[PDB]
Amino acid sequence: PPLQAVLVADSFDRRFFPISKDQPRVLLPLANVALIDYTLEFLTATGVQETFVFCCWKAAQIKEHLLKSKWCRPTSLNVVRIITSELYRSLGDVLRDVDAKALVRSDFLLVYGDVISNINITRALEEHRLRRKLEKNVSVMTMIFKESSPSHPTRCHEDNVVVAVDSTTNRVLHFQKTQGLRRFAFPLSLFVEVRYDLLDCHISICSPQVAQLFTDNFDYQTRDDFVRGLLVNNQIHMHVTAKEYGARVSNLHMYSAVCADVIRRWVYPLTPEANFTDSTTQSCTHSRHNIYRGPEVSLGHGSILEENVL
Amino acid sequence: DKELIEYFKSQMKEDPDMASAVAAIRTLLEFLKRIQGLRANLTSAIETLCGVDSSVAVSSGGELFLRFISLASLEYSDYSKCKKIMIERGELFLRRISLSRNKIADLCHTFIKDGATILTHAYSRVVLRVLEAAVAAKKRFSVYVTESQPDLSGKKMAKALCHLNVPVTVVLDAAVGYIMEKADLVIVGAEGVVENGGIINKIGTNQMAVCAKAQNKPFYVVAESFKFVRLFPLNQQDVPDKFKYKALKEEHPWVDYTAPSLITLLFTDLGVLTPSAVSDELIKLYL
Numbered sequence: 001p002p003l004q005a006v007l008v009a010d011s012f013d014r015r016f017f018p019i020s021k022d023q024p025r026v027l028l029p030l031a032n033v034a035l036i037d038y039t040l041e042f043l044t045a046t047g048v049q050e051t052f053v054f055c056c057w058k059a060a061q062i063k064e065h066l067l068k069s070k071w072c073r074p075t076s077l078n079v080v081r082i083i084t085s086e087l088y089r090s091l092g093d094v095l096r097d098v099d100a101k102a103l104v105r106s107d108f109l110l111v112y113g114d115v116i117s118n119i120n121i122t123r124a125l126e127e128h129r130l131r132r133k134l135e136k137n138v139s140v141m142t143m144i145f146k147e148s149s150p151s152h153p154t155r156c157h158e159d160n161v162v163v164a165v166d167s168t169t170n171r172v173l174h175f176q177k178t179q180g181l182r183r184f185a186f187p188l189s190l191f192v193e194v195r196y197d198l199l200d201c202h203i204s205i206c207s208p209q210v211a212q213l214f215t216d217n218f219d220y221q222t223r224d225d226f227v228r229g230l231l232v233n234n235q236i237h238m239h240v241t242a243k244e245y246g247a248r249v250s251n252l253h254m255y256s257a258v259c260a261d262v263i264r265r266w267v268y269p270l271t272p273e274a275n276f277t278d279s280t281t282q283s284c285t286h287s288r289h290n291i292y293r294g295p296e297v298s299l300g301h302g303s304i305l306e307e308n309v310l
Numbered sequence: 311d312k313e314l315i316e317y318f319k320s321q322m323k324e325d326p327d328m329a330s331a332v333a334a335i336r337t338l339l340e341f342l343k344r345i346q347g348l349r350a351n352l353t354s355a356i357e358t359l360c361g362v363d364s365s366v367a368v369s370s371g372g373e374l375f376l377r378f379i380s381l382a383s384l385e386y387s388d389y390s391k392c393k394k395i396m397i398e399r400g401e402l403f404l405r406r407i408s409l410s411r412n413k414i415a416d417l418c419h420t421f422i423k424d425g426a427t428i429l430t431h432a433y434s435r436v437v438l439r440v441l442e443a444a445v446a447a448k449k450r451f452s453v454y455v456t457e458s459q460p461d462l463s464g465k466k467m468a469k470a471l472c473h474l475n476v477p478v479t480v481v482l483d484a485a486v487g488y489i490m491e492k493a494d495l496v497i498v499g500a501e502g503v504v505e506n507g508g509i510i511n512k513i514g515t516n517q518m519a520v521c522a523k524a525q526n527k528p529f530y531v532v533a534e535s536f537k538f539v540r541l542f543p544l545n546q547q548d549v550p551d552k553f554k555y556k557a558l559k560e561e562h563p564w565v566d567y568t569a570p571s572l573i574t575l576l577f578t579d580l581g582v583l584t585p586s587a588v589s590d591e592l593i594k595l596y597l
């Protein structure tokens with residue numbers, strides 16, 4: 001079947017305040033390129049058609065940028081169908097608005113609109129579909145985590161989720177955000193590896209039942225609430241990547257981390273000189289030390305660009 | 311017969327930027343404007359013009375013009391119709407080498423990295439044009455130039471290249487092996503390109519190249535199409551004494567032969583050339 005995606009193009013945490021006041025925190029440029037133009041390109045790299053884009057906060061800028069972007073032309077094999085409504089206050093309202101409209105009819109990718117990644121969801125998607133027909137809707141989601149190391153700039157110490165995973169079947173048994181914590185409480189009912197080297201990366205591959213599981217239980221608001229509230233009750237599994245980058249841009253710290261990772265070519269098909277958005281005003285030449293200079297830059301005399309300059 | 315030399319000196323006077331061989335072409339073409347004895351007259355013009363300048367370029371640039379016109383005489387023969395097809399073909403040849411330095415600059419200025427530091431010998435109106443096109447493409451570099459005794463042409467080049475706002479250093483003539491590690495690439499202008507692809511340039515070019523291959527610095531030569539001379543030296547003695555000498559004992563040769571193994575590329579008029587490729591072109595320029 002065709003692969004769909006839901007792209008929540010309004011992050012519902014008031015996190016980039018006051019930069020979110022004058023530009024939406026999905027349209028602010030990462031490395032001369034808006035964040036959505038990464039995640040949209042990400043979905044186009046995955047093999048995604050029908051990438052629904054949900055905009056609530058300042059949808060005028062987002063829609064007027066999307067229609068002048070690469071993926072709104074008919075040449076793109078990733079149709080968008082921007083859904084604009086002010087009713088959404090959280091991700092729960094977005095996935096509840098998926099129902100009563102039935103936009104998804106197979107398993108879909110739920111990126112959160114500011115993801116930046118070169119992940120290939122074909123191994124993970126085929127593993128998800130393999131244990132979806134096999135156990136007859138036991139699984140509802142397949143979270144995508146990056147095999148990180150806990151002392152990394154990309155790990156903000158504001159997400160840092162620890163999980164308890166059954167290593168033979170990759171099922172997530174426990175999940176909690178370790179924002180303020182020194183010792184981690186794991187209940188003994190889940191008896192089984194316990195992993196902290198997992199960058200969250202927010203590329204869940206949730207089946208349409210998840211959109212069902214957000215509507216009947218109206219109390220949910222976000223994906224963290226969903227994973228916590230269903231691991232107490234219908235089986236979130238996971239897939240861990242090691243050779244591909246993935247991280248969203250939740251706050252301005254991890255903005256700096258992901259922008260320094262993109263410049264240093266960690267997201268290799270999405271380097272600034274690749275010009276993955278086909279704009280004429282963003283061409284570059286990767287010179288020697290990840291020094292990219294655009295067209296007609298006119299560097300001065302005696303100025304030194306040491307490394308990682310765009 | 312004597313006004314020929316006067317006109318050639320005049321073409322030097324009201325055009326110093328014009329090459330010596332092109333001046334020979336122009337004065338010989340005017341002499342052409344004044345059957346098969348006319349070929350003998352043009353050969354006498356070659357002899358008298360080479361007798362007063364003695365550069366390789368003059369006795370080669372004029373010698374291709376003895377062949378670029380005699381190629382048309384292979385197609386057809388006449389008495390005054392052949393003279394007019396000679397003048398409309400020679401004018402084409404002459405206006406096709408007025409564009410030589412620009413083509414060489416367009417090919418060669420892409421070989422200079424940004425922030426490079428080139429090393430050049432005495433004074434070339436082609437190397438100067440390569441650097442003039444390289445600063446017009448917003449590249450910034452450093453130029454090392456040897457003063458290149460006895461006529462101190464390096465100081466003339468550095469005075470002619472300081473107007474381009476380039477950091478230029480008039481290094482001592484002996485200090486090529488010293489600053490040679492401070493050089494990313496070597497650009498010299500040949501006074502003649504011999505049949506094996508090597509060059510004949512002002513004295514000191516050879517030891518610039520021998521140091522270059524000692525440190526694997528690329529040695530680029532920017533010659534022109536009319537400088538392709540048919541000589542084949544095997545050592546520095548095999549260069550004729552016509553070309554070496556312009557006139558406790560002094561020696562003073564003025565040119566020396568650079569072996570083709572020392573040359574990385576030639577940026578001639580007719581495209582970028584491997585040193586081997588030159589030989590083919592010479593065959594094509596003389597059938």
Ligand SMILES: O=P(O)(O)OC[C@H]1O[C@](O)(CO)[C@@H](O)[C@@H]1O
Nearest residue numbers: 432433434435436499500501512
């Ligand atoms: O570039 P030009 O002026 O035609 O001559 C090139 C070479 O001939 C000389 O002017 C004389 O040998 C050298 O200074 C130079 O390297």
